[PDB]
Every structure is written in C-alpha cells, then in structure tokens.
Design a protein around this nucleic acid. Structure first.
Ligand SMILES: [Cl-]
Length: 513
RNA sequence: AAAUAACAUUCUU
C-alpha cells in the first residue's frame, strides 16, 4: 500500500538517529538531535492517521522524548549559571515542548488513535513522573484498563509497567497487601522476573522500612541483571542511600560508592546525596555527621562533575551549616575557614561555593563576613558570574553598617558586570537585589519599632529605578518593583505618591547592552 | 529484551 511511505521512512530514520545520539557518549550532532525531535513530532501528527504507525514507532518516539527531557536537564546543569526566570531560555521552551508533545501522545493513546507497547508505556509514565505529575501517572495507567484496544491495555499491565507503578501506588495507598503478595511470588519464582518489577518492589519496601525484603529482592536483582542494562541496580542502590530512614543502612550503601565496592558502575547522584544529608540532619541534628558525608562527596566529585552538581551539594550543606550556627558566628567563622581550606585542597574553588555561603550567611547579619567572601573571590581567582554581584548587593539588606554610597557602588559594579558579560537588559533578579537592600531592610526596621513598642534607602531605591528604567527588560518591571512591591512591603506606599515627578542623580557607564 | 540522567547559588508580583 504505502500511502504514508515517505513520512514513515523519514520518521524511522529521524527517531533512530536521535535515539542513537542520546544513548551513545553548539555542534552539528547536537543540532541534529534537537531538530530530529521536532521533525519526528511533526511527522507524528501526520502519521497518527496511518495504520502502519505501529506501537513500535510510537514507543520509539516516546523514548526519544524521554531522552530529550534527560538531555534538557543535563544542559541546564552544565551552564555557567541558571538562566533568569523572566528571560527566554532554551531550557524552559524545550521542556514545555517535550511535555506538551508527551501530553498529545498520551491523549491519543487514551482515545485510541495510536497503539503503544509496554516499552513505550514505561517511558511515557516515567517521563510524566520526572515532570512531577505523579497523580496523572496513576490516572493514565488506570484509564488504560478500560481501553477498547486490548493489546495496549495489556501492555500497561506488563510487569515492567507494574514495577514503575508500585512506588506511586504505595505513596498513595500505603498498602503493603499487593506488594507482600508479589514478594511471596517473586522470591521463589523460577520464571523470568522483569528487573523493573524488582526495582519498584525494592523501592516500596525501602519506604516501608521492610529492609530485609528490600535487600533480599536486591540480591536476586543483582545476580540476574544483564551488563548492558544494569541501570536497575543504580536506581535501587541510590534508593537505599536517599530513601532509607535507617541512616546506618543508607551510609553503608553510600560507602559502597565511595569505596568503589560494587561490580557495576554507579554515579553519586547529587539529588541522592542531598536527600541523605537532609535525612541525617532531620533525624540526628549532628552537623559533624553531615560534614563528614559532605567531605566524602566533595572528594568523590573532585573535578569530574559539572560545577552545577557541586553547587547543588553545597546548597544543601551550607543551608544546614547556617541553621546549625544560626546563633554562633564566632565558632561558625572558624568552621568556615576549615571548610574553605578543605575545599581548596580538593579542587579550585568555584563561584557557587562562595555564592551559597554568602547567601546563607545573611542570618548572621554582620558586615565582616560580606567583606570576607568578597575578598576571597579575588584571593582564590574565581571565574566571576553575575550571581556574586547580585548577592553582594542583596547582602547589604541584612546589615545596618552600610550607607547609600556602598549600595550604589555594589549596584554600579553589578550593572558594569552585566554589560561586561554581554547581558542585554536589566532582569528581575537584578532589581530584586536592589529592592532587598533597601525596601526590605526599611520595612524590617519599621516592623521592629512597632513590635518593640545616607539616611534613606527607599529614596535611593526609587531614584535608581527611575534612572535605569530605559535599561529594563520590560517597562512592566516599574509596576512590579513599585506598586506591586508596595502590596508586600507597605512602607513603599508612603514614598510613591510623588514618583512621577522624582528626579535622578546617578552614574551609569554602559558598554554592551 | 530495549537499562541509567544530578531539576544548583542570585528571581513574591
Ligand atoms: Cl554570568
């Protein structure tokens, strides 16, 4: 027959080319991969009317969109900094495109236009899980039971699809009935048991803290696992680290990665490490235990991982640090120096390391720690981004020992660094830092006097807003940081009746905008 | 059968 022959042929070449790229270890291949996705998705809306659009072709497309989500997340962490929320970014639009593309395919399956296999069903539901749509995963799965096409309905009931579903079902129902029945069948079964069924059942038992059943299934999973498809052992192993409430079992599995004890490769996934650090802090309140695990993670990473990974780790660590030393900047400052010395001994210091430290140090409300971090950027020869200059301006809102001159200086140096790094206009995060250093500080000191029972920063704030308005990303930022900001900080309302007639006296000196 | 993917520091509007 072949009415849609050319579109079917190009779809197979497209999907296979991009799937091979995303499974093998800007650039022409990078551009090909992302253009192959839009083209394949474009062909999908035409080929869904064809009868030769089998479950295999749909499943290969769903897998490809899944790898697109994986690649988009990877690209976000490889950047020198996260893009501003209010500006255009490849990460945001590509994520929405993949997500919307996955919605259209899920709806076409729930209606019956296209068929899907158990392999395609798992990538569809895993994708929606990675998009934080757990409840939608349960609806799609249970709606597959009452489908006309019994073949696709049977695919959603295959063991590997059930394996993905078990952790979501235990989160909702908290029922161990169906899991324990499956445990009795699987432990003594001589038949083929899909590794993803092992994985989901292990994860349930880890959350349920029935660790003996979790470790027993884990041993069977290991002896049966195939070298080419060993990733099931990675998910379960990491689950023991980040999900086990028994910290002694979690740390043993953590050491198995540090000491390279396992027969399979495994990444020290920072999300898993962060959850492990948080569980130690919530359960033990032992900062030394948190500090010892953080030290092992930093030495494990070294220079092998992206700076965005260590940034996420240091975020968790310094958040715990400044909660522990919330009322002790004296012993805290000595401990920070030990942390800086250790971190220097592992690798060259990255900027997010000091950015997180400076951000969280606002609880101390002292100027010495601000000048200490600012000095260390130059001392350790840190590649600078605009994040530091934003935080250095924001930090002035947590101390009283400063003047409108220093607020201007740290604002001017931020605008300079914006144009030095080729930034187009002034983003929301830039104005939010100036607002936090003026309006929030003034509202804070005002609320203290009411609760208790270079003289004005709000005037400088409104002067810079009006002076630098033509450099804004959008003129709607004027309403956002004036009338809209007054709804949250009412002390701005008493300065705003005469904003239209206000004059400005500042010192811009731009370059590239 | 077709595994595995770190959601980072600065951003209420
Ligand atoms: Cl930057």
């Amino acid at each position: 027959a072949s009415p849609w022959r050319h579109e079917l042929l190009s779809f197979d070449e497209c999907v296979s080319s991009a799937l091979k790229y995303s499974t093998t270890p800007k650039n022409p291949s990078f551009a090909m991969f992302w253009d192959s996705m839009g083209r394949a998705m474009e062909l999908y809306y035409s080929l869904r009317e064809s009868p030769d659009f089998n479950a295999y072709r749909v499943s290969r497309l769903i897998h490809l969109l899944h790898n697109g989500l994986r690649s988009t997340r990877d690209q976000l962490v490889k950047l020198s900094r996260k893009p501003d929320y209010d500006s255009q970014s490849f990460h945001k639009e590509m994520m929405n495109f993949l997500c919307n593309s996955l919605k259209d395919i899920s709806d076409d399956i729930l209606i019956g236009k296209v068929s899907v296999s158990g392999y395609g069903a798992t990538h569809l539901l895993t994708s929606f899980k990675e998009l934080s749509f757990d409840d939608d995963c349960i609806r799609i799965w249970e709606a597959s039971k009452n489908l006309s096409d019994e073949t696709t309905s049977q695919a959603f009931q295959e063991p590997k699809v059930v394996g993905f579903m078990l952790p979501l079902l235990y989160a909702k129902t908290r029922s161990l009935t169906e899991p324990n029945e499956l445990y009795n069948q699987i432990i003594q079964s001589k038949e083929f048991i899909h590794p993803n069924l092992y994985s989901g059942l292990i994860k349930v038992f880890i959350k349920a803290e029935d660790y003996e059943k979790a470790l027993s299934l884990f041993g069977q999973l290991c002896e049966k696992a195939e070298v080419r498809n060993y990733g099931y052992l990675i998910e379960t192993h990491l689950s023991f680290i980040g999900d086990s409430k028994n910290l002694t079992l979690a740390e043993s599995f953590f050491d198995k990665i540090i000491n390279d004890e396992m027969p399979y490769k495994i990444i020290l996934q920072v999300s898993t490490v962060n959850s492990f650090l948080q569980n130690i802090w919530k359960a033990q309140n032992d900062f030394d235990h948190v500090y010892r695990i953080w030290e092992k993670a930093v030495k494990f990473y070294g220079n092998t991982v992206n700076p965005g990974i260590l940034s996420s780790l240091n975020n968790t660590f310094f958040t715990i640090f400044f909660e522990n030393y919330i009322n002790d900047n004296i012993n805290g400052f000595r401990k920070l120096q030990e942390i800086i010395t250790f971190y220097s001994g592992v690798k060259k210091i990255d900027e997010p390391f000091f950015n997180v430290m400076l951000t969280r140090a606002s609880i101390w409300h002292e100027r010495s720690i601000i000048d200490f971090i600012d000095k260390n950027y130059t001392l350790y020869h840190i590649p600078r981004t605009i994040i530091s200059y934003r935080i250095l301006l924001k930090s002035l809102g947590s101390i009283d020992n400063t003047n409108n001159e220093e607020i201007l200086d740290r604002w001017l140096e931020l605008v300079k660094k914006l144009n030095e790094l080729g930034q187009q206009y002034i983003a929301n995060a830039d104005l939010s830092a100036l607002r936090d250093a003026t309006v929030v500080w003034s509202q804070s000191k005002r609320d203290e006097k009411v609760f208790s029972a270079s003289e004005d920063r709000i005037e400088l704030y409104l002067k810079i807003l009006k002076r630098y308005t033509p450099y804004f990303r959008a003129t709607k930022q004027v309403y956002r940081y004036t009338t809209g900001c007054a709804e949250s900080y009412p002390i701005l309302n008493e300065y705003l009746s005469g904003y239209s007639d206000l004059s400005a006296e500042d010192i811009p000196v731009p370059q590239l905008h």
